[PDB]
Amino acid sequence: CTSILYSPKDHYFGRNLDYEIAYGQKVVITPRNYEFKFANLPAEKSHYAMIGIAAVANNTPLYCDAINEKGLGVAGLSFAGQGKYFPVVEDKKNIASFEFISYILATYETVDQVKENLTDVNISDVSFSKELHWLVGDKTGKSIVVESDEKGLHVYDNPVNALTNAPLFPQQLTNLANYAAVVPGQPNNDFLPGVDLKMYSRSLGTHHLPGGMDSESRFVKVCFALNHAPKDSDEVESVTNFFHILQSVEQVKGMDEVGPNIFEYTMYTSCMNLEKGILYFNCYDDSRISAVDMNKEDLSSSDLIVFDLFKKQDISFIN
Amino acid sequence: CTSILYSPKDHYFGRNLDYEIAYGQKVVITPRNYEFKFANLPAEKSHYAMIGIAAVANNTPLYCDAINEKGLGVAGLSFAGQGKYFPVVEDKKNIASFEFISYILATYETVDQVKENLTDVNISDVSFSKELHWLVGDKTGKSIVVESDEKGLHVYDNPVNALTNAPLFPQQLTNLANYAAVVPGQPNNDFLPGVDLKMYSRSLGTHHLPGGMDSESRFVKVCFALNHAPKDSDEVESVTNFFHILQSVEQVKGMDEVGPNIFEYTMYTSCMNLEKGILYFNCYDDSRISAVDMNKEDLSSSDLIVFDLFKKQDISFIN
Amino acid sequence: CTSILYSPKDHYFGRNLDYEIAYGQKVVITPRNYEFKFANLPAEKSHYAMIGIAAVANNTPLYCDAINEKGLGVAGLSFAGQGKYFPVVEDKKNIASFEFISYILATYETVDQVKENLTDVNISDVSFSKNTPASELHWLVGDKTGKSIVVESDEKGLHVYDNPVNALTNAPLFPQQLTNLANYAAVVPGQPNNDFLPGVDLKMYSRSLGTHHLPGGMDSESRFVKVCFALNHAPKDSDEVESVTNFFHILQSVEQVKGMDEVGPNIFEYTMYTSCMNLEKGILYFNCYDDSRISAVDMNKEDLSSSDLIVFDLFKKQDISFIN
Amino acid sequence: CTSILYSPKDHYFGRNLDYEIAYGQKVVITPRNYEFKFANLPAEKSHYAMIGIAAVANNTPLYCDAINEKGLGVAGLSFAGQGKYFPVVEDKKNIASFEFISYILATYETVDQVKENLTDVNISDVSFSKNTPASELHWLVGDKTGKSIVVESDEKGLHVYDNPVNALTNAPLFPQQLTNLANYAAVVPGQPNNDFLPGVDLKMYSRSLGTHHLPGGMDSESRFVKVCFALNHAPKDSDEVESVTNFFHILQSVEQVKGMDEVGPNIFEYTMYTSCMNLEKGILYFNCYDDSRISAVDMNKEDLSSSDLIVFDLFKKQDISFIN
Numbered sequence A, B: 001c002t003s004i005l006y007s008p009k010d011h012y013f014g015r016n017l018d019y020e021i022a023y024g025q026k027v028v029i030t031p032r033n034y035e036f037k038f039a040n041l042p043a044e045k046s047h048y049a050m051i052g053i054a055a056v057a058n059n060t061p062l063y064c065d066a067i068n069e070k071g072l073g074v075a076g077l078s079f080a081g082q083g084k085y086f087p088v089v090e091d092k093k094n095i096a097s098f099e100f101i102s103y104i105l106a107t108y109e110t111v112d113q114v115k116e117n118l119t120d121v122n123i124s125d126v127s128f129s130k131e132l133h134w135l136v137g138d139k140t141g142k143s144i145v146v147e148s149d150e151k152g153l154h155v156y157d158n159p160v161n162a163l164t165n166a167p168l169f170p171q172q173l174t175n176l177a178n179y180a181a182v183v184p185g186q187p188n189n190d191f192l193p194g195v196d197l198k199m200y201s202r203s204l205g206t207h208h209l210p211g212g213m214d215s216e217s218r219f220v221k222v223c224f225a226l227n228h229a230p231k232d233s234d235e236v237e238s239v240t241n242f243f244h245i246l247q248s249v250e251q252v253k254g255m256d257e258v259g260p261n262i263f264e265y266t267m268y269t270s271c272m273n274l275e276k277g278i279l280y281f282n283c284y285d286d287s288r289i290s291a292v293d294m295n296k297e298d299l300s301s302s303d304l305i306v307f308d309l310f311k312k313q314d315i316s317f318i319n
Numbered sequence C, D: 001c002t003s004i005l006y007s008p009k010d011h012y013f014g015r016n017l018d019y020e021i022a023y024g025q026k027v028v029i030t031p032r033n034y035e036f037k038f039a040n041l042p043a044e045k046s047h048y049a050m051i052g053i054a055a056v057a058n059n060t061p062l063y064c065d066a067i068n069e070k071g072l073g074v075a076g077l078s079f080a081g082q083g084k085y086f087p088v089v090e091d092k093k094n095i096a097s098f099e100f101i102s103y104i105l106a107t108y109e110t111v112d113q114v115k116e117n118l119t120d121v122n123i124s125d126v127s128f129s130k131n132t133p134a135s136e137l138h139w140l141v142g143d144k145t146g147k148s149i150v151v152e153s154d155e156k157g158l159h160v161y162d163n164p165v166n167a168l169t170n171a172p173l174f175p176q177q178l179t180n181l182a183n184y185a186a187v188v189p190g191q192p193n194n195d196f197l198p199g200v201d202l203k204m205y206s207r208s209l210g211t212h213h214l215p216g217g218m219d220s221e222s223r224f225v226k227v228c229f230a231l232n233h234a235p236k237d238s239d240e241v242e243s244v245t246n247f248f249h250i251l252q253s254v255e256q257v258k259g260m261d262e263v264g265p266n267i268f269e270y271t272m273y274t275s276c277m278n279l280e281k282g283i284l285y286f287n288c289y290d291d292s293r294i295s296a297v298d299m300n301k302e303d304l305s306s307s308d309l310i311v312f313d314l315f316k317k318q319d320i321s322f323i324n
C-alpha cells in the first residue's frame, strides 16, 4: 500500500490499497452523533464527523483511511513482520488497532494535537473477534507516522509525507539516501570526467529509480513523484495530479505474486480534500473518478451514510 | 513513449504518448475512399479503412498510432539520436516517415505481409515541410520493429511485443537479459545459502525492476507487466488490463525533466481492439476511458471523421 | 572498512582498513604480563596475550583489530552517525572505546563468554587522545567456533546481535544491514532460470548474469552485501596457505582503490592495509596498499611471558621479485 | 576478463584473465629473429620482439596479451556469442585469430598504424588446435600515445572502434558497452547534491553514497562499468613503482574470487593472473591467484636478436615473507 499527503494549494490525503482479496469496503460517512463504543476507552456519543473508505461490519465502520471535518486525516497500512500490539495496561490509554482511525479522527483536529496526546497511548491486542501502522496528516502540510513494534509505540515526524509497509520508518528514511544522486533530468558527467557519454535517452538521471512492487521500491518512487508534483493548482487539477502520483506505484495484476497464482493489485485509490471534505475515488475496474461530499449531508445525524466504492468500467461511448 | 501488443483473447494495440507539448491530436477515422497522396509513391484512392490518433493538418491525417479494418496495427515512436532517413533512390520504394503509418495500414493486412514487402523499402528524408521508429502488430499475436539507422532499414522480430525509444532494438533485447533473475514473487535464497534472510516485504523478487522514466527502464518494466498480464478475458476486462499495463510506465508531471522547467508526461493512452476496430482512449486530464467504433460509420465514404481526444476530468458526482 | 570471520577449516579473523588518515599503525604483540591500566576498571597485571594491528602512544597499544592466544578476535570499525558513547555510571561496567579490544581480548575466551558478560557493560565517553577527532566505533567479535556477534552502542544504549553472515562494515545499525540483505535474495553466482519473462528466449549474453545487481560501490551497504556474498561462497576445507590466499581475495573484492571514494577536496579513502589472523595458530598475515606481498608474524614465536610490547613494521614498500 | 590501458606518466598495458580452464600459460619473450609462420600471410623471419603471456605449443607462442619493443600492446579477450570468424578469401588480408596478437605486435608500431592497416583485413576461421574448443575473441590495442582501439569481428564483418575509456571486457558489442556507460552518469566518487528530494534533509549515513549504484557483479557489463570508473579516477603523474601498484589495484577492483562466478557444476571462473606491461620500458609485471606478490621480467635484459622463445614461470606459490 502507498499513502501520501499532497499540498499543492489545498491539502489532499489518500492511499492506494494493494491487496489480493476485498473486504466489502465502501464509502461511509460517520456523522457527529454516531455513538462510538471503544474496548478500553470511554464512549463518544458526540464527536467530529468523518468520511472515508471502510468495511461496514453490522452498523459499525471499520475504516481503512478517512478524514474528519477539522482537516485531519489518518490512513492504515499493513505492518506485517514488524508491528507488535500489547495487552491492555491500566497505566496508559489503550486503543485497539481497528478503532485507532475512528478514535483519532473523532477526538482531535491537528497533527500536533495527535502527536502530543499519544505519549500515554498503548495500541492494544484487542481484535474485532479472532499488524498495522498509520500515517496521520493535516492541513499544515505535515504528517507523522505511528508504529508500534517490539520496543513499544513510536511517533515519527514524516519529512516526505508518504508511507508504505515494512520495514521500520527510520529504516525507510535511511534507504532514501541511497538514491540521493537521482535527478528527474540529465546528471552532470562527474562519473567519467573528460569522456563524452552518449546521453541516448531523456531522464537518464532516473535510471536507478526503483520500480518494484515491494515496500521499499514503492516508498522511494512515490516520495520522488510526490516531491516533484505540480503546485499551486485548483481543485480538479490537484486531484488529477494526486491520482497520477499514486499511479506511479500502481500494482498491476500479475506483477506482485504473494501466493500460488495469487496476486496483490491496486484495488482502489482514494483522494480526500482535507479542507472541503470531499472524497474522490476510483478502483481497479473503474478508471473514472467519483466524488462524495461529506458536507452535503446532515452531519448532526446519527446513522452511517454508505456509498458504493467498487464499480464497473464507466466507458463513455462517443458513437 | 511505450507501445504494446496485448493478446488476452482478442488482440489490442496501443501506446503511451509521453511528451511536453501537444500537436492538436484527435481521434480520426480515414474511410476507404479518402485519397492518399504520397511523395514518391503512387496514390491510393481505394484502400483499407483505419482509425487512430492523428494530428489533422488541413484535411490530411498525420497518424501517431492507428489500426485498420483487417486487424493490422502500426505505432510511431521517437528514435532521436539513433534513426537516420535517406534521400530518395530510384532502386527502392521510397516512403516518407510521416506517411509510413498511413501507407502500411492502407495497403497490407498482416505482419508477415508487411515484413516481406519491406525488403525494397527506403524511409526517405521527405519532411512535411521543414527521427522515428515503428512497432507493427496484427491478430496473430506477433509484432515486428522497423528501424532505419546509420546502416539502413531494419525489420526485427519482436519477441516481447513492446517498444519504447533509444537505443537500437537489438540492444534493448540484450538489456532485457540483465533482469533475468526478477520474479513477481519471492526468490529462492541461493544468494546466501544456509542463512535465513528476513523476507520483510512481499515481491522482493522485483526489488531491481526498473522504474525510471528513461527509455530502457520503461522498456524493461512494460515487458514485465505485459508478460504477466491476465489472459482469456472479455472485452471490458481486457481493455481495463491494457490501460493498467501502460499505467505501469506512466510519466507523471515533474518526474521527467527534458528542459529548464519543461517536463515530459503521458499526454494520452490509446487502446485499439484489432478485431472489433474500436479505439479506447483517455488522457492526462481525463481518467475516464472513451471509445470510438470505426465500424459504426460509413467506411465507403471519403471524408475524415474526427473526434475529440483531449477532454477534461469527467468526475462522477455521487452527491 | 570491512571485517570478516572465515572458517574453511581453521578460523581466520581480519579486516580491511579503508581511510584517508593514517595513525602510525604497526603489528603489536601484547604479552601476558604487560600491565593494562583501564580508565574505570581494575588494572590487570596478568591476562591473555594478543597480537594485532595497533598504534602505540606513550607505550599503550590502541588496537584497531587483534586476536588473543586463545582464539578469540575483535575488530573495531567506525560507526559514525549511529554510535553514541555515554558518561560513566557507578553501577555499570564502564569500558572506554579505545580499551574495548584490549579489555575483551585480555579477559575472555569465547563469543559466548563475551556475550554473557556484556549484560551490564556501558561504553563510556572517556577518550584517550584529546586532540585527535575520532568517530564512534562498533565491534565484531568471533572465535574458533565459527560464530560471531556485533557489539553496537547507539542512541538507545548497548546492543549485542548474533551475526549470521560473519561480516561487518559501517553504518547503518546491524538489523538494518541484515534487512538490506533480503533485497538481494535473487542474486546467484551463475545464471538464473528465466521466470522473468516466461515464454521468451532471453539471450544470456554474458556469464554470471545472476550477479548483475551485486553492489560494487565504496559505500558501507554495498561492501557489506558483496563481502557477505564473497564470504559465503568462498572455498572450504583448505590448508593454511590456500585459506589465507582465499581470505585476502574475499576482502580484495571490496577493496577501495585511490580515487573511487572521495571524502573531501581531492582526499580519498582507500584500503590502507588488510589483516588476516589465524585464530588457531595465532599467526597474523597482512599486506598494505603499497606492498601487495603478504607478510606473517607468529605470536607464539615470541616470549609471551614478557612485560613489554613487541612491535613490527606494518606498512612496507612494494616487494617486487625480479625474475631476471 | 578485463583489460585496461593506464597512462599516469608512463603507459601500462595489461589485463585480468578470468577463466575456469588453464592452458599452461607462461611469460614468453619472442625475439626479433624467431621466424613467424602465418597461415595465409607471408612468413616474417625478422620483425619486432615482444613480451607477454602465452601458451607454447610445438614451439609456437599463442599469446593472450603482450607488448612489443616499440611500445604497442594487444590483448585478447573472449567474445562468445558475438564474435564470428570467416572463411579465407583471396582479396582480403587473412589473419587467423590465434596469430592476431603475434602478427600485429611484430609488424606495426602505433595504434594509428594498426588502424590504417586493418582496412582490408579479414579475421579467418583457421584454428590452431583442432580439439581445444575456444570461443571467438575480440582485441584491445593501445600504445604510448594513451589512445586505444577495439578490434571486433562479428556477424557483419570486422569493425575498429576508437576506445574513449581505454578498457575492454567481453560481450556485448563495444557500441553497446559505451551506451551502457551513460546509464551511470549520475555516479560520483563522493556525495551528490540532494536534487533527488529538494527540501528534505536526507541523512547521508555513509561515505561515497554516490557509488551506491556502481556495479560490482562478475558479469561482463558490470566489470566494464566499474573498471572504467576505477581507471578514470586512478592517480596520475606517478613514478614506476607507484604506477604499477595503482595498476594492479584498478584490476583488483573487478577481481573474480573463487565461488562468485559459477560457470558449471561447482566450476567457477576466477581471476587466474594479472599482467601489467610498461610500454615505455618493456617490463612485464604479473601475479596470479595463488601468488599475491608481484614479479617482473625485463624484455631488454635478454638478447633480442636471438631466434628462440625465452620462457619464464607465470603461476607461482604464495610467496609469504615471514617477519620472525
Ligand SMILES: *CC(=O)CC[C@@H](C)[C@H]1CC[C@H]2[C@@H]3CC[C@@H]4C[C@H](OS(=O)(=O)O)CC[C@]4(C)[C@H]3CC[C@]12C
Binding pocket: A001, A002, A016, A017, A018, A019, A023, A055, A062, A063, A064, A076, A077, A078, A079, A097, A098, A126, A127, A128, A129, A130, A165
Ligand atoms: C496494502 C496493505 O498494506 C494491505 C492492508 C489491508 C490488508 C488492511 C488495511 C486496513 C485493514 C482493515 C482495518 C479495519 C479492520 C481491522 C481488523 O483488525 S483486527 O481487529 O486485529 O482483526 C481486521 C479487519 C479490518 C477491516 C482490516 C482488514 C485489513 C485491511 C483492509
Ligand SMILES: *CC(=O)CC[C@@H](C)[C@H]1CC[C@H]2[C@@H]3CC[C@@H]4C[C@H](OS(=O)(=O)O)CC[C@]4(C)[C@H]3CC[C@]12C
Binding pocket: B001, B002, B016, B017, B018, B019, B023, B055, B062, B063, B064, B076, B077, B078, B079, B097, B098, B126, B127, B128, B129, B130, B165
Ligand atoms: C514519446 C515519444 O517518443 C514522442 C513522439 C512524438 C514526439 C511523435 C510521435 C508521432 C509524431 C508525429 C507523426 C506524424 C508527423 C510526422 C512529421 O515528421 S516530418 O515530416 O519529418 O516533420 C512531424 C509531425 C508529426 C505530426 C509528428 C509529430 C511528433 C510525434 C507526435
Ligand SMILES: *CC(=O)CC[C@@H](C)[C@H]1CC[C@H]2[C@@H]3CC[C@@H]4C[C@H](OS(=O)(=O)O)CC[C@]4(C)[C@H]3CC[C@]12C
Binding pocket: C001, C002, C017, C018, C019, C023, C055, C062, C063, C064, C076, C077, C078, C079, C097, C098, C126, C127, C128, C129, C130, C132, C133, C134, C169, C170
Ligand atoms: C573504516 C573504519 O570503520 C575504521 C575507522 C578508522 C579511522 C579507525 C578504526 C580503529 C581506530 C583507532 C582505534 C585505536 C585508537 C582509538 C582512539 O580513540 S579516542 O579514545 O578517541 O582517542 C583514537 C586513536 C586510535 C588509534 C583510532 C584511530 C582511528 C581508527 C584507525
Ligand SMILES: *CC(=O)CC[C@@H](C)[C@H]1CC[C@H]2[C@@H]3CC[C@@H]4C[C@H](OS(=O)(=O)O)CC[C@]4(C)[C@H]3CC[C@]12C
Binding pocket: D001, D002, D017, D018, D019, D023, D055, D062, D063, D064, D076, D077, D078, D079, D097, D098, D126, D127, D128, D129, D130, D132, D133, D134, D169, D170
Ligand atoms: C575472459 C576472457 O575473455 C579470456 C578467455 C580465455 C579463455 C582465452 C583468452 C586468450 C586465449 C588463448 C589465446 C591463444 C590460443 C588461441 C587458440 O585458438 S584456436 O585457434 O582455436 O586454437 C586456443 C588456445 C589459446 C592458448 C587460447 C586459449 C583461451 C584463452 C586463454
